[PDB]
Amino acid sequence: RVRARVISHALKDILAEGDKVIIMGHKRPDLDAIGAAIGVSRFAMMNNLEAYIVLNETDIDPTLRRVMNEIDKKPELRERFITSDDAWDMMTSKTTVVIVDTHKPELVLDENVLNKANRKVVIDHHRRGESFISNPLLIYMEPYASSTAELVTELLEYQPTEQRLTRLESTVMYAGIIVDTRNFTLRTGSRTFDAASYLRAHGADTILTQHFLKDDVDTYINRSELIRTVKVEDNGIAIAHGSDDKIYHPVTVAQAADELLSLEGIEASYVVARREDNLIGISARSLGSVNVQLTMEALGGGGHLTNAATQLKGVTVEEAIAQLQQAITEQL
Amino acid sequence: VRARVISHALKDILAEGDKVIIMGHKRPDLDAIGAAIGVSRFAMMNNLEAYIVLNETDIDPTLRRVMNEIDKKPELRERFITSDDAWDMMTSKTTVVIVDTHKPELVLDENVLNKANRKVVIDHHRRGESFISNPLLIYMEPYASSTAELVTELLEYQPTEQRLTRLESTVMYAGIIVDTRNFTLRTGSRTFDAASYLRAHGADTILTQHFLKDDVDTYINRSELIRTVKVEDNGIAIAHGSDDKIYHPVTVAQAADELLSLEGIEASYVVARREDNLIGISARSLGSVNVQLTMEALGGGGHLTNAATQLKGVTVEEAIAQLQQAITEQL
Ligand SMILES: [Mn+2]
Ligand SMILES: [Mn+2]
Ligand SMILES: [Mn+2]
Ligand SMILES: [Mn+2]
């Protein structure tokens, strides 16, 4: 964590050297993007700098809308959020733009604001890709961190404490970590917990966080409809499916596969369900022993060791299942 | 600095006696076992002789999954002994460390506790009526998530040549997971500090998940109930089992708990037959709607957020009608 100290003070000099700070994450921002951004704006405010977060009404999905409702009703946080246009009008060549939770120009919330910026900072927890923000004054990329919220939280700890992180700000930063880690089950290191400690110390509300993230009744029902069918082999391979005649939401199929991993005896889950009139979807997950990337690549799809997917043209659910088992027996 | 003071005081007490006997509560859960394992690592860090009392009849199915892993590590497996062996090896200079409880009658083996001349108590519950007599040291903190969290703090101030192992860390961590329902309850910054320390010592999330796997049958029973839920505009939800199927009381309770995790639901009522002549209802609430009053109105009771009742002599449909009438009245 030598890096966090140096980066925190280097960041503060860059931000203070400019006339003000404009913060953006990726398009259709999730709670890590928004929590990280909130975090940076608190970073700016601890040093009495002027900071805004770019967000348009059309960027606000249902999860984020629950966060924003809370922000409107219970603090003064809303004043920091500004539209693209207001962002544009307000920028000068001395304005520092900080990009959080992405590093590809084409994924940035507003690429025009990005292109107008002479001064850029990038903070993200993925590894550098093909595209990358051009000519940044400072790059803070940590592939092994849980989330951008975690990275930003660490930077806060080095800054003056007079203008402290508020309860609601820390709650959104916390929610972002919860989402990116699947409640501390993925990409969670001791430093993730260090960040969780700092945030909870500043009032991060675990109950409110749960509230932002509740699924609805229909999703639970559709999902359990898939789970109910599960057949678990002795080797820990579980297959579940929807009727050939029922269309399922792709996310519901993914969730079903996720949830089967919480059940006794299941090492790897495969959920098979109609996605379109002429397309069958499969989502696969595993706890690391069985490689589902391999299974799905054998069926013309792909992904990663623990989570992959494929889609099959012009087959019935029963045919897809048979193709799937053929692949499994071959692989295992 | 209080934990620092407790850590060092406890070390002198343990090194003063001839050996250490560690004991949790009857029917130990993962926090009681995790804490006990932590106290045994505490002892080994100072090259002291420590055992954990555990009888085969004290090992429920969750704990068995854990003991299956511990069996793979003889160094750790050998620390676990029966009540008989503990009693037999105890002396006037043996220190007994009671973890995760403070009531004599709740301790795993009261006979061992009664034979003990030197006692230490580490727990995270509010002190009540009966209490361990004449403790040399007491570490009680009703705000902590768990005893594992408490013991982790003590470990931090001890020599590190003989560190907490990956498996030991994992069990302690799983204890915190169970007691906080995955950082959702009774969880403070210090809880996360403990998690950080355990994780730095290799605490394994995937193994923890293995310990806490849910049975498939029961997931399927629970969801049969949930599937039926009907949610009113006021956030009141009612779910039911069919009139001809008996559900286990614990499954009904879990279903009621699970409904509160769904959007728009302020209070849940789950109605399922529990016998040939008895209908059960578990009621739960986020804390706004009072289900104690509803249940009391139906000849039951409990608490504001969590209550229940049993209705003799009605079908599920009648129980539902009567429940709605109570709900209407309350409103
Ligand atoms: Mn993101
Ligand atoms: Mn992220
Ligand atoms: Mn306990
Ligand atoms: Mn406990």
Side-chain angles (χ1 to χ4, degrees), chain B residues 231-299:
Chain B
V231 187
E232 310 297 321
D233 299 327
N234 59 8
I236 291 171
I238 292 163
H240 69 276
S242 63
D243 184 51
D244 51 15
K245 180 178 182 175
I246 291 166
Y247 281 83
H248 199 289
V250 177
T251 301
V252 177
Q254 293 179 340
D257 289 341
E258 187 132 357
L259 287 165
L260 299 196
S261 75
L262 302 177
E263 183 179 66
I265 297 177
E266 286 288 328
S268 54
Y269 302 87
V270 183
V271 187
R273 178 171 296 285
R274 53 193 284 150
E275 325 169 350
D276 199 46
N277 197 38
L278 195 62
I279 309 297
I281 302 174
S282 291
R284 299 288 185 277
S285 179
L286 296 176
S288 157
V289 176
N290 185 325
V291 300
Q292 181 189 337
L293 299 189
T294 324
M295 290 303 93
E296 278 172 352
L298 295 166

XYZ file of all heavy atoms in Angstrom, chain B residues 231-299:
509
model
N -48.720 -9.516 -2.739
C -48.298 -8.290 -2.077
C -49.267 -7.146 -2.331
O -49.485 -6.773 -3.475
C -46.928 -7.828 -2.585
C -46.440 -6.651 -1.751
C -45.934 -8.981 -2.549
N -49.823 -6.588 -1.256
C -50.718 -5.433 -1.335
C -49.942 -4.128 -1.538
O -48.722 -4.077 -1.347
C -51.564 -5.326 -0.062
C -52.266 -6.623 0.334
C -53.274 -7.087 -0.706
O -53.985 -6.232 -1.281
O -53.358 -8.312 -0.954
N -50.665 -3.070 -1.901
C -50.063 -1.775 -2.189
C -49.385 -1.163 -0.967
O -48.493 -0.319 -1.096
C -51.122 -0.821 -2.748
C -51.732 -1.325 -4.056
O -51.011 -1.985 -4.842
O -52.934 -1.064 -4.298
N -49.800 -1.598 0.220
C -49.206 -1.111 1.463
C -47.950 -1.892 1.879
O -47.395 -1.680 2.965
C -50.244 -1.104 2.591
C -50.847 -2.484 2.858
O -50.399 -3.499 2.318
N -51.872 -2.520 3.707
N -47.506 -2.797 1.013
C -46.309 -3.571 1.290
C -46.535 -4.795 2.163
O -45.580 -5.430 2.607
N -47.795 -5.140 2.413
C -48.091 -6.332 3.206
C -48.207 -7.565 2.324
O -48.998 -7.591 1.386
C -49.361 -6.170 4.084
C -49.097 -5.158 5.199
C -49.767 -7.509 4.702
C -50.332 -4.777 5.976
N -47.412 -8.587 2.634
C -47.362 -9.781 1.802
C -47.875 -11.005 2.551
O -47.541 -11.212 3.720
C -45.944 -10.031 1.313
N -48.681 -11.812 1.873
C -49.116 -13.087 2.428
C -48.751 -14.214 1.474
O -48.951 -14.108 0.269
C -50.632 -13.097 2.686
C -50.976 -12.124 3.818
C -51.114 -14.511 3.014
C -52.460 -11.750 3.863
N -48.195 -15.284 2.028
C -47.814 -16.453 1.256
C -48.392 -17.664 1.966
O -48.594 -17.636 3.190
C -46.292 -16.559 1.171
N -48.667 -18.732 1.230
C -49.244 -19.909 1.888
C -48.835 -21.230 1.238
O -48.529 -21.270 0.048
C -50.772 -19.799 1.878
C -51.371 -19.933 0.509
N -51.471 -18.876 -0.366
C -51.871 -21.010 -0.142
C -52.021 -19.291 -1.495
N -52.275 -20.582 -1.382
N -48.838 -22.304 2.026
C -48.718 -23.655 1.498
C -50.107 -24.214 1.223
O -51.102 -23.703 1.752
N -50.199 -25.251 0.398
C -51.507 -25.851 0.123
C -52.091 -26.480 1.389
O -51.362 -26.802 2.331
C -51.422 -26.878 -1.003
O -50.574 -27.951 -0.641
N -53.410 -26.645 1.415
C -54.080 -27.152 2.608
C -53.733 -28.609 2.932
O -53.886 -29.044 4.078
C -55.596 -27.000 2.488
C -56.325 -27.425 3.752
O -55.947 -26.949 4.851
O -57.264 -28.250 3.648
N -53.258 -29.354 1.937
C -52.979 -30.778 2.128
C -51.501 -31.131 2.327
O -51.152 -32.306 2.355
C -53.566 -31.608 0.980
C -53.179 -31.074 -0.392
O -52.245 -30.244 -0.472
O -53.808 -31.487 -1.393
N -50.637 -30.127 2.463
C -49.215 -30.386 2.683
C -48.705 -29.741 3.952
O -48.846 -28.542 4.156
C -48.365 -29.918 1.499
C -46.878 -30.168 1.699
C -46.039 -29.735 0.498
C -44.552 -30.038 0.725
N -43.728 -29.731 -0.488
N -48.101 -30.554 4.802
C -47.494 -30.071 6.028
C -46.079 -29.579 5.753
O -45.295 -30.249 5.077
C -47.458 -31.175 7.085
C -48.889 -31.493 7.553
C -46.558 -30.775 8.244
C -49.017 -32.781 8.339
N -45.767 -28.395 6.264
C -44.441 -27.822 6.117
C -43.751 -27.808 7.460
O -44.385 -27.617 8.493
C -44.511 -26.402 5.535
C -44.730 -26.377 4.044
C -46.009 -26.496 3.509
C -43.656 -26.235 3.159
C -46.217 -26.478 2.148
C -43.858 -26.215 1.792
C -45.139 -26.342 1.291
O -45.363 -26.332 -0.067
N -42.443 -28.030 7.446
C -41.644 -27.872 8.643
C -41.677 -26.420 9.131
O -41.510 -25.494 8.336
C -40.203 -28.294 8.361
C -39.422 -28.604 9.595
N -39.017 -27.629 10.478
C -38.983 -29.780 10.102
C -38.355 -28.189 11.475
N -38.321 -29.494 11.273
N -41.876 -26.218 10.445
C -41.929 -24.870 11.025
C -40.731 -24.004 10.648
O -40.888 -22.803 10.432
C -41.912 -25.135 12.530
C -42.541 -26.497 12.673
C -42.102 -27.269 11.456
N -39.544 -24.593 10.588
C -38.352 -23.806 10.294
C -38.353 -23.337 8.835
O -37.917 -22.233 8.537
C -37.061 -24.577 10.622
C -35.831 -23.753 10.239
C -37.036 -24.939 12.102
N -38.854 -24.180 7.935
C -39.001 -23.801 6.534
C -39.992 -22.639 6.379
O -39.751 -21.718 5.597
C -39.436 -24.996 5.647
O -38.467 -26.045 5.747
C -39.546 -24.576 4.195
N -41.095 -22.673 7.128
C -42.083 -21.574 7.091
C -41.471 -20.253 7.573
O -41.625 -19.213 6.943
C -43.352 -21.904 7.924
C -44.314 -20.728 7.933
C -44.047 -23.127 7.364
N -40.771 -20.315 8.697
C -40.018 -19.188 9.229
C -39.006 -18.601 8.222
O -38.941 -17.389 8.018
C -39.286 -19.633 10.492
N -38.197 -19.463 7.619
C -37.234 -19.016 6.621
C -37.919 -18.332 5.448
O -37.464 -17.291 4.983
C -36.396 -20.193 6.133
C -35.492 -20.746 7.209
C -34.691 -21.922 6.720
O -35.051 -22.556 5.729
N -33.600 -22.228 7.414
N -39.025 -18.907 4.978
C -39.762 -18.305 3.880
C -40.202 -16.895 4.244
O -40.134 -15.993 3.418
C -40.959 -19.145 3.501
N -40.659 -16.716 5.479
C -41.101 -15.406 5.948
C -39.926 -14.422 5.984
O -40.076 -13.253 5.603
C -41.745 -15.530 7.344
N -38.771 -14.903 6.460
C -37.548 -14.102 6.487
C -37.175 -13.701 5.070
O -36.871 -12.541 4.810
C -36.373 -14.876 7.097
C -36.507 -15.075 8.586
O -37.292 -14.332 9.218
O -35.816 -15.969 9.129
N -37.198 -14.671 4.161
C -36.789 -14.436 2.778
C -37.672 -13.427 2.058
O -37.200 -12.688 1.194
C -36.752 -15.749 1.994
C -36.167 -15.599 0.599
C -35.113 -16.648 0.285
O -34.801 -17.470 1.181
O -34.597 -16.642 -0.857
N -38.958 -13.389 2.392
C -39.828 -12.425 1.731
C -39.415 -10.972 1.982
O -39.641 -10.107 1.147
C -41.287 -12.659 2.112
C -41.850 -13.904 1.436
C -43.181 -14.338 2.092
C -42.028 -13.647 -0.048
N -38.793 -10.706 3.125
C -38.387 -9.339 3.449
C -37.232 -8.878 2.567
O -36.896 -7.689 2.549
C -37.973 -9.223 4.917
C -38.999 -9.536 5.997
C -38.503 -8.979 7.333
C -40.357 -8.962 5.633
N -36.610 -9.817 1.856
C -35.499 -9.473 0.967
C -35.994 -9.061 -0.408
O -35.196 -8.673 -1.271
C -34.509 -10.635 0.838
O -35.047 -11.658 0.016
N -37.308 -9.137 -0.618
C -37.867 -8.826 -1.923
C -38.429 -7.405 -1.949
O -38.898 -6.891 -0.927
C -38.942 -9.843 -2.324
C -38.512 -11.311 -2.383
C -39.694 -12.196 -2.719
C -37.386 -11.493 -3.396
N -38.388 -6.786 -3.125
C -38.777 -5.383 -3.302
C -40.210 -5.139 -2.875
O -41.084 -5.967 -3.133
C -38.638 -5.010 -4.779
C -38.947 -3.564 -5.115
C -38.766 -3.290 -6.599
O -39.540 -3.850 -7.411
O -37.833 -2.537 -6.951
N -40.455 -4.001 -2.229
C -41.813 -3.556 -1.938
C -42.492 -4.242 -0.755
O -43.609 -3.885 -0.393
N -41.832 -5.219 -0.140
C -42.450 -5.942 0.974
C -42.040 -5.375 2.334
O -40.865 -5.410 2.706
C -42.161 -7.456 0.898
C -42.780 -8.037 -0.378
C -42.665 -8.174 2.146
C -42.500 -9.511 -0.582
N -43.022 -4.845 3.062
C -42.796 -4.247 4.377
C -42.967 -5.265 5.499
O -42.293 -5.193 6.534
C -43.760 -3.073 4.598
C -43.426 -1.804 3.823
C -42.200 -1.091 4.367
O -41.952 -1.163 5.588
O -41.474 -0.463 3.566
N -43.883 -6.209 5.300
C -44.114 -7.258 6.288
C -44.568 -8.538 5.601
O -45.332 -8.488 4.631
C -45.149 -6.804 7.320
N -44.089 -9.685 6.077
C -44.517 -10.944 5.479
C -45.314 -11.817 6.442
O -44.999 -11.893 7.620
C -43.324 -11.733 4.931
O -42.332 -11.923 5.917
N -46.343 -12.477 5.921
C -47.036 -13.521 6.670
C -47.087 -14.772 5.803
O -47.551 -14.730 4.667
C -48.460 -13.104 7.044
C -48.571 -11.843 7.866
C -48.638 -10.598 7.252
C -48.649 -11.897 9.259
C -48.759 -9.434 8.003
C -48.767 -10.740 10.017
C -48.823 -9.511 9.382
O -48.943 -8.354 10.120
N -46.610 -15.882 6.348
C -46.572 -17.140 5.634
C -47.415 -18.153 6.414
O -47.140 -18.425 7.588
C -45.123 -17.669 5.486
C -45.105 -18.948 4.662
C -44.201 -16.605 4.846
N -48.428 -18.691 5.740
C -49.416 -19.585 6.336
C -49.267 -20.996 5.774
O -49.508 -21.226 4.589
C -50.851 -19.100 6.025
C -51.885 -19.938 6.781
C -50.994 -17.600 6.324
N -48.876 -21.944 6.620
C -48.717 -23.323 6.163
C -49.216 -24.322 7.196
O -49.012 -24.131 8.384
C -47.261 -23.601 5.846
N -49.837 -25.403 6.737
C -50.290 -26.434 7.666
C -49.088 -27.021 8.414
O -48.066 -27.344 7.806
C -51.048 -27.541 6.928
C -51.509 -28.675 7.859
C -52.442 -29.643 7.169
N -53.696 -29.008 6.768
C -54.677 -28.686 7.612
N -54.544 -28.922 8.909
N -55.791 -28.109 7.159
N -49.180 -27.140 9.730
C -48.115 -27.822 10.452
C -48.516 -29.194 11.028
O -47.646 -30.038 11.265
C -47.424 -26.910 11.471
C -48.328 -26.227 12.428
C -47.584 -25.134 13.161
N -46.694 -25.637 14.203
C -45.568 -25.030 14.566
N -45.174 -23.917 13.948
N -44.820 -25.546 15.523
N -49.817 -29.426 11.225
C -50.307 -30.773 11.542
C -51.680 -31.037 10.946
O -52.261 -30.186 10.283
C -50.395 -31.018 13.045
C -49.319 -30.370 13.877
C -49.647 -30.444 15.355
O -50.791 -30.831 15.687
O -48.769 -30.116 16.183
N -52.208 -32.224 11.215
C -53.532 -32.589 10.731
C -54.609 -31.618 11.247
O -55.649 -31.430 10.610
C -53.871 -34.028 11.143
C -54.994 -34.619 10.312
O -54.950 -34.478 9.070
O -55.931 -35.204 10.894
N -54.354 -30.994 12.393
C -55.332 -30.093 12.999
C -54.806 -28.701 13.366
O -55.422 -28.006 14.179
C -55.927 -30.742 14.258
C -57.215 -30.076 14.695
O -58.038 -29.676 13.860
N -57.395 -29.936 16.009
N -53.683 -28.290 12.775
C -52.989 -27.079 13.209
C -52.365 -26.316 12.028
O -51.682 -26.912 11.182
C -51.909 -27.450 14.221
C -51.282 -26.340 15.065
C -52.345 -25.658 15.943
C -50.159 -26.897 15.933
N -52.616 -25.005 11.960
C -52.018 -24.167 10.926
C -51.020 -23.253 11.597
O -51.278 -22.728 12.680
C -53.042 -23.291 10.165
C -54.213 -24.122 9.654
C -52.374 -22.631 8.972
C -53.827 -25.169 8.645
N -49.865 -23.078 10.968
C -48.855 -22.189 11.514
C -48.751 -20.928 10.679
O -49.011 -20.943 9.479
N -48.367 -19.832 11.318
C -48.093 -18.594 10.607
C -46.844 -17.965 11.196
O -46.772 -17.733 12.399
C -49.246 -17.565 10.744
C -50.572 -18.134 10.232
C -48.896 -16.255 10.008
C -51.751 -17.209 10.472
N -45.860 -17.703 10.347
C -44.723 -16.899 10.743
C -44.871 -15.514 10.133
O -45.200 -15.373 8.954
C -43.402 -17.540 10.300
O -43.156 -18.721 11.035
N -44.622 -14.500 10.947
C -44.764 -13.113 10.531
C -43.442 -12.417 10.755
O -42.762 -12.663 11.756
C -45.874 -12.421 11.325
N -43.069 -11.568 9.806
C -41.814 -10.837 9.888
C -42.039 -9.426 9.396
O -42.968 -9.166 8.627
C -40.735 -11.515 9.045
C -40.405 -12.932 9.485
C -39.622 -12.974 10.800
N -39.234 -14.348 11.115
C -40.023 -15.234 11.714
N -41.249 -14.896 12.094
N -39.586 -16.461 11.936
N -41.191 -8.511 9.833
C -41.331 -7.129 9.416
C -39.987 -6.431 9.369
O -39.069 -6.769 10.130
C -42.253 -6.369 10.374
O -42.375 -5.009 9.985
N -39.885 -5.449 8.477
C -38.703 -4.605 8.399
C -38.565 -3.734 9.652
O -37.465 -3.310 10.003
C -38.746 -3.743 7.136
C -38.709 -4.530 5.822
C -38.863 -3.597 4.637
C -37.419 -5.325 5.717
N -39.679 -3.472 10.331
C -39.628 -2.735 11.582
C -40.637 -1.606 11.645
O -40.729 -0.898 12.646
N -41.392 -1.432 10.567
C -42.444 -0.425 10.534
C -43.763 -1.060 10.932
O -44.372 -0.668 11.930
C -42.549 0.202 9.145
O -43.831 0.769 8.930
N -44.200 -2.050 10.156
C -45.401 -2.810 10.497
C -45.140 -3.700 11.712
O -44.098 -4.341 11.821
C -45.896 -3.669 9.321
C -47.080 -4.527 9.749
C -46.257 -2.791 8.124
N -46.090 -3.723 12.637
C -45.943 -4.496 13.856
C -46.696 -5.819 13.742
O -47.919 -5.835 13.809
C -46.465 -3.691 15.049
C -46.237 -4.395 16.371
O -46.306 -5.620 16.454
N -45.965 -3.623 17.416
N -45.964 -6.922 13.574
C -46.587 -8.232 13.377
C -46.803 -8.947 14.703
O -47.402 -10.017 14.752
C -45.744 -9.139 12.465
C -45.555 -8.509 11.097
C -44.407 -9.447 13.120
N -46.285 -8.370 15.774
C -46.555 -8.879 17.114
C -48.037 -8.687 17.421
O -48.715 -9.621 17.843
C -45.699 -8.155 18.148
C -45.907 -8.632 19.570
C -45.199 -7.752 20.586
O -44.236 -7.050 20.263
N -45.679 -7.781 21.821
N -48.539 -7.480 17.177
C -49.962 -7.185 17.361
C -50.875 -8.080 16.518
O -51.886 -8.574 17.015
C -50.264 -5.711 17.073
C -49.544 -4.697 17.963
C -50.090 -3.294 17.724
C -49.687 -5.078 19.426
N -50.528 -8.285 15.248
C -51.323 -9.163 14.385
C -51.348 -10.581 14.945
O -52.380 -11.252 14.949
C -50.731 -9.279 12.969
O -50.163 -8.031 12.562
C -51.790 -9.706 12.001
N -50.191 -11.048 15.397
C -50.100 -12.415 15.855
C -50.800 -12.536 17.204
O -51.541 -13.491 17.436
C -48.647 -12.893 15.905
C -47.999 -13.076 14.517
S -48.887 -14.222 13.429
C -49.965 -13.108 12.531
N -50.590 -11.554 18.078
C -51.283 -11.545 19.364
C -52.786 -11.611 19.137
O -53.485 -12.391 19.781
C -50.913 -10.316 20.186
C -49.601 -10.457 20.930
C -49.162 -9.165 21.581
O -49.807 -8.127 21.319
O -48.171 -9.183 22.348
N -53.276 -10.814 18.197
C -54.695 -10.809 17.865
C -55.196 -12.191 17.452
O -56.395 -12.455 17.478
C -54.993 -9.784 16.774
N -54.279 -13.072 17.067
C -54.659 -14.419 16.638
C -54.198 -15.480 17.642
O -54.095 -16.662 17.315
C -54.117 -14.712 15.233
C -54.697 -13.841 14.116
C -53.867 -13.949 12.838
C -56.134 -14.236 13.851
N -53.918 -15.046 18.865
C -53.621 -15.966 19.946
C -52.186 -16.442 19.947
O -51.886 -17.518 20.461
